[PDB]
Amino acid sequence: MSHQFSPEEQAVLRIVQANLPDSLTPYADLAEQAGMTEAQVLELLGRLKASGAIRRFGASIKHQKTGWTHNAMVAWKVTPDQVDDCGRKAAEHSHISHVYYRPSSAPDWPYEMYTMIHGRSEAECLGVVEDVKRTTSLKEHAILRSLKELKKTSMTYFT
């Protein structure tokens, strides 16, 4: 972090990565806690918002069903000429949020295209898997059913 941000700026970012101070005047509170002027606090956040480094400065809210219920990570074989078309045609499905291509040259892990599938039931999530086979050239796959969630944590970027 010290190559991109002064110590005072990192002090700001450490506070805001959790919560804004709870007053009418949070940016003046940030300035007194960190080394700096309220105007410098606002320039710093303003700069990172503008650049995209801060994706959102604001309220994260509950509900809005973050995927009705029930997730499904499935990995598919795919040749280089198929990647972009399959990735695109796969991503078009309403129940598929995103598709990654993660190359692999492990002989016993030949799957490279990952479709993150959303559902209600088992056989819905697997129904989406049949949907992918009829609407893309993807065929061979491995369902990596989650058995146990071992860690679930948010990243701390400013320490």
Binding site: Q17, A53, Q64, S97, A106, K152, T159
Partner: protein, 145 residues
Amino acid sequence: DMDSMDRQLLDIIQTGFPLSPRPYAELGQRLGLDEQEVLDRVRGLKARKIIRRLGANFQSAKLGFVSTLCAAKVPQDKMDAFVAEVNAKPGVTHNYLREHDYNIWFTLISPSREETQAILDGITQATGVPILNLPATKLFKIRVD
């Protein structure tokens, strides 16, 4: 669960809580509310937990961090020690037991591809278990709510 003023407020402050000296006043000006009522409302929505957090959300890549997905074939006899070494890492934010020969799958974020590999190499040296480092080179479309 709340009034139309609260939905207007949230619509504003999920796009962006204002960067100005008196943010509640700016919001009050825009919503037709006095400054203190907008703070009162924010504080109530946080305490009813409809607002989970009010603060910054960062784009990792733009802060110079890289992310990957890791996978291993973990024998029953190494499971406990493996899982503990993996969960010990602050840059591991997801770790899952999954139904496949490759039965341990985790994400790992760090400042660089080299730091990430050194982390993975240390895990393997501690547990004797090799790990596949599987970074994404293409993403096809991503959404949240």
